[PDB]
Every structure is written in structure tokens, then in C-alpha cells.
């Protein structure tokens, strides 16, 4: 089938193709993009979500996070220490200080080695999970604030909003800040735009090999595994690419740059780190292909306020012939990670 390498793909849509979000996602899936779990989409040169970013210095980061990393030989656990609120100006001041700034380097392979060699030292601050958007109110193409996908059935039918899932999150980062391995809540899709700043590097494991990654993680962190069915959802586990390589876990890497979009797919494990001071925005979204992932997503069974979406409305509206079967817990549909979402039908003929 398509993209049998399950390698990370990059797309350059024209302004025409760009306009319909859900439609372009259907397209890239018809090209096998999802098989890698992660994909890059470079927006048209004439596209910009905001005019200028010189007016956010006063924007407040209510819960900055200091990332303490503990571990050795490729396996680490990240602990969060919440610091007092601060502004984007204060944050940047710190991000650029000779204390937390980016080390000198030539090729990316070098910055990478330095990241994996010093991530346990000099714990950085991460202005993550910040409620808000940097999109201009009139931007109608790929506006994270309103992608208009079926995930809207959640708020529209129940009124329930889940910060970060069906509302945007801003992430202000600095050198060495990172994000642990994980898939989205309810195994949804994810859209990430890097408004500005230094690059953000990503690691991705193909959804078709996700179970292998979990198996490995469970063997390394048996304690966390025995305490939770999906401890990777805590987002505290870091695993180096060398360790994955050494245990035969298929994975790919890619560096996202300011102005580019990254898309993660259902059950696509990903992790990465920021090269330096930057700002990114993200939220989740869905397609009809997601519904099945949602019904089968293995959720965190030890924390409260953990994201759990009712799959009822989706199964009832898009899988009516399986609703009673599903409701009776008799629906044993097996998921094929290679198949594109049905909306991509028009692109396969
Ligand atoms: O987990 C993701 O989808 C990306 C998270 C990334 O934006 C971060 O800074 O944590
Ligand atoms: Cl700026
Ligand atoms: Ni994610
Ligand atoms: Zn848990």
C-alpha cells in the first residue's frame, strides 16, 4: 500500500487546497501520511495567522513548569515543578539568559547529542498548557481555534469543553524543554503550529508499531506499569532514539520550524524538545477514522480529571448499525492503522 516505509512525510498545499482543513487531512491520509504517526505541512507563503507577535510580551503564563529530569542510559522520568506566574517577556528574558540559552552547534545531530547528554542538568522552565490562541480573529484557514471537524460534536451536544482538546493551548519553550512520549487523549489527532522562535524537534513511532513501544516502556518502567494501564499518558517518560534503535522500535525524526504545521495521528506516539525560546499552539481534532480509536483508547486509570470523552454520540451518529452491538460490549472491530479515513475516498479514485 502507500508509504510502506511509514516515514514522516511533508506537504506543501496551495492556498486552494489549504482552505478546507478536514479535506486536506483526508488527502494526506490518501497518500499514507498517517502511517508514520506524524506529518509536516508547510502552509502557503501567502498565509499568516497573525500580523505581528510583538504585542504579547504582557501575555501571562499562569503556571510555568520547571522540568526536573532524572534517569540514565536513555531512560528518563520527568517531574514537574510549578513556578509562579510570569509574562512572556519575563519568560523570554530567562530563556535567553546565558544560563538557559541554546548551546553552540553546527549540525542538528550535534544539538541532539547535547540534548540527550544534558537533559538531566540545569532544569529549564516550560510555559506550557497556556489557555489562549495567537490566531487573528478573521483567519479562516487552519485556525486552531475553529478547525470545524467532527470533534465539535462534543461541545455542540453536551456543552463540555476540555482545555487543550477542543480549545487551543499555547506553549512557550526554551532550550532543553521537552515533551515525553505519548499519544493524544482518546487517541485523537493533533495539530501543532509553531508561531515563532527556535525549532522544535520531533520523534515519532508508527501507529502500527505503537504496541511495541508500550511493551518496551512497560519493561523499563514496571512500577509505573503496575500502577496504571496507560502510564505513558502522564507524559513523564522520556526514551532516547538510541534506546529505541537498540530494541528495534521503528521510529522517525523531524525538526519543525517556525511557520510550519505538525499533525499527529490517532495512536501515533511522539516526543521531542525545543531548540530554544519559541511559541507553539496546538489542540486536538478528529475524523471518522478516529471514532474507532476513541472507542478503544486505553485510558489512564489512576488520575482524576483525566480526559475521557463519551463515544456514544459518535457511535450513534456514524456507526448506527453497530450501536447496540457496541453498547452491549460486543463490538470487536480490529483497527487497521494503514487504512486512510473514509473522507479520503474521493482521492483514491
Ligand atoms: O504532544 C503533542 O501533541 C505536542 C506537545 C508539544 O506541543 C509540547 O510542547 O508539549
Ligand atoms: Cl517575538
Ligand atoms: Ni501530543
Ligand atoms: Zn494514570
Do the beta carbons of residue 268 and residue 206 sit within 8 Å?
yes
Q: In the numeric block, which cell numbers belong to residue 335?
A: 483497527
Q: In the numeric block, which cell numbers belong to residue 31?
A: 497518500
SS3 93: helix
How far away, in angstroms, is 148 Cα from ligand 3 center?
19
Question: 192 CB less than 6 Å from ligand 1?
Answer: yes
228 labelled as ligand-binding?
Answer: yes
Neighbours of 228 (CB within 10 A): 18
Q: Note if 270 is an active site residue.
A: yes
Q: Counting atoms of ligand 1 from 1, which one is nearest the CA of 171?
A: 9
**CA-nearest residue, atom 6 of ligand 1:** 179
Do the beta carbons of residue 342 and residue 288 sit within 8 Å?
yes
Question: 213 CB less than 6 Å from ligand 1?
Answer: no
Distance in angstroms (rounded) separating the CA atoms of residues 346 and 56: 42
| HSE-CB of 118 using CA atoms within 13 angstroms | 15
The one-character DSSP state at 346 is: G
The dihedral through the CA atoms of 200, 263, 50, 15 has a sign that is positive
Element counts in the chain: helices (H) and strands (E): 11, 16
Distance in angstroms (rounded) separating the CA atoms of residues 15 and 18: 5
Q: Method used for this model?
A: X-ray
Distance in angstroms (rounded) separating the CA atoms of residues 227 and 224: 5
Distance in angstroms (rounded) separating the CA atoms of residues 120 and 7: 30
Question: 264 CB less than 6 Å from ligand 1?
Answer: yes
Instruction: Pick the closest to residue 331 from 343, 346, 320 (CA basis).
Output: 320
Q: Which residues contact 299 (CB under 8 A, 6 or more apart)?
A: 186, 229, 230, 233, 306, 307, 308
Distance in angstroms (rounded) separating the CA atoms of residues 277 and 331: 47
Question: 282 CB less than 6 Å from ligand 1?
Answer: yes
How far away, in angstroms, is 18 Cα from ligand 3 center?
22
How far away, in angstroms, is 108 Cα from ligand 3 center?
22
**CA distances in angstroms from 282 to 9, 101, 135, 157, 176, listed in the order given:** 19, 24, 11, 23, 20
C-alpha torsion angle, residues 57, 62, 66, 67 (rounded to 10) = -100
Q: Note if 282 is an active site residue.
A: yes
Domain ranges in the chain are: 8-349
Bridge partner list, 197: 278
- Which of 133-167 are b and which e, b meaning 16 or more Cβ less than 10 Å from the residue's Cβ? bbbeeebeebbbeebebbbebbeeeeeeebebbbb
**CA distances in angstroms from 264 to 105, 169, 233, 267, listed in the order given:** 29, 15, 15, 8
**CA-nearest residue, atom 10 of ligand 1:** 179
Superfamily name and number for 8-349:
Cupin (2.60.120.650)
How far away, in angstroms, is 21 Cα from ligand 1 center?
20
Do the beta carbons of residue 124 and residue 177 sit within 8 Å?
yes
Element spanning 196, H or E: strand 189-197
How would you list the strands of the sheet with 38-41, edge to edge? 9-11, 38-41, 261-264, 189-197, 278-285, 169-173, 125-131, 65-72, 75-82, 237-239
Q: Note if 201 is an active site residue.
A: no
The one-character DSSP state at 137 is: T
200 labelled as ligand-binding?
Answer: yes
302 labelled as ligand-binding?
Answer: yes
Phi and psi of 221, rounded to 5°? -115, 65
282, 284, 285: residue to mutate for ligand 1 pocket, most atoms within 8 A of CB: 282
Do the beta carbons of residue 162 and residue 307 sit within 8 Å?
yes
Amino acid at each position: 500500500t502507500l508509504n510502506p516505509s511509514a516515514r514522516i512525510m511533508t506537504f506543501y498545499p496551495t492556498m486552494e487546497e489549504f482552505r478546507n482543513f478536514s479535506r486536506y487531512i483526508a488527502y494526506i491520509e490518501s497518500q499514507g501520511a498517517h502511517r508514520a504517526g506524524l506529518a509536516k505541512v508547510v502552509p502557503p507563503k501567502e498565509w499568516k495567522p497573525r500580523a505581528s507577535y510583538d504585542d504579547i510580551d504582557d501575555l501571562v503564563i499562569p503556571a510555568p513548569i520547571q522540568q526536573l529530569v532524572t534517569g540514565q542510559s536513555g531512560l528518563f522520568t520527568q517531574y514537574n515543578i510549578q513556578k509562579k506566574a510570569m509574562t512572556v517577556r519575563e519568560f523570554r528574558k530567562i530563556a535567553n539568559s546565558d544560563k538557559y540559552c541554546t548551546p553552540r552547534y553546527s549540525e542538528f545531530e550535534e544539538l541532539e547529542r547535547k540534548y540527550w547528554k544534558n537533559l538531566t542538568f540545569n532544569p529549564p522552565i516550560y510555559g506550557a498548557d497556556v489557555n489562549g490562541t495567537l490566531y487573528e480573529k478573521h483567519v479562516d484557514e487552519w485556525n486552531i481555534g475553529r478547525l470545524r471537524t467532527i470533534l465539535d460534536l462534543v461541545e455542540k451536544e453536551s456543552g463540555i469543553t476540555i482545555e487543550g482538546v477542543n480549545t487551543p493551548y499555547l506553549y512557550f519553550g526554551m532550550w532543553k524543554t521537552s515533551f515525553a512520549w505519548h499519544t493524544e487523549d482518546m487517541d485523537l489527532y493533533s495539530i501543532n503550529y509553531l508561531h515563532f522562535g527556535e525549532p522544535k524537534s520531533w520523534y515519532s513511532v508508527p501507529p502500527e508499531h505503537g504496541k511495541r513501544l508500550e511493551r518496551l516502556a512497560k519493561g523499563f518502567f514496571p512500577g509505573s506499569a503496575q500502577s496504571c494501564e496507560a502510564f505513558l499518558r502522564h507524559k513523564m517518560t522520556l526514551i532516547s532514539p538510541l534506546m529505541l534503535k537498540k530494541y528495534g522500535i521503528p521510529f522517525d525524526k523531524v525538526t519543525q520550524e517556525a511557520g510550519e504545521f505538525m499533525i499527529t495521528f490517532p495512536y501515533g506516539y511522539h516526543a521531542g524538545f525545543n531548540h530554544g525560546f519559541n511559541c507553539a499552539e496546538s489542540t486536538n481534532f478528529a475524523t471518522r477514522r478516529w471514532i474507532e480509536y476513541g472507542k478503544q483508547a486505553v485510558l489512564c486509570s489512576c488520575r482524576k480529571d483525566m480526559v475521557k470523552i463519551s463515544m456514544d454520540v459518535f457511535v450513534r451518529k456514524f456507526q448506527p448499525e453497530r450501536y447496540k452491538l457496541w453498547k452491549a460490549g460486543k463490538d470487536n472491530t480490529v483497527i487497521d492503522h494503514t487504512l486512510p479515513t473514509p473522507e479520503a475516498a474521493e482521492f483514491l479514485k
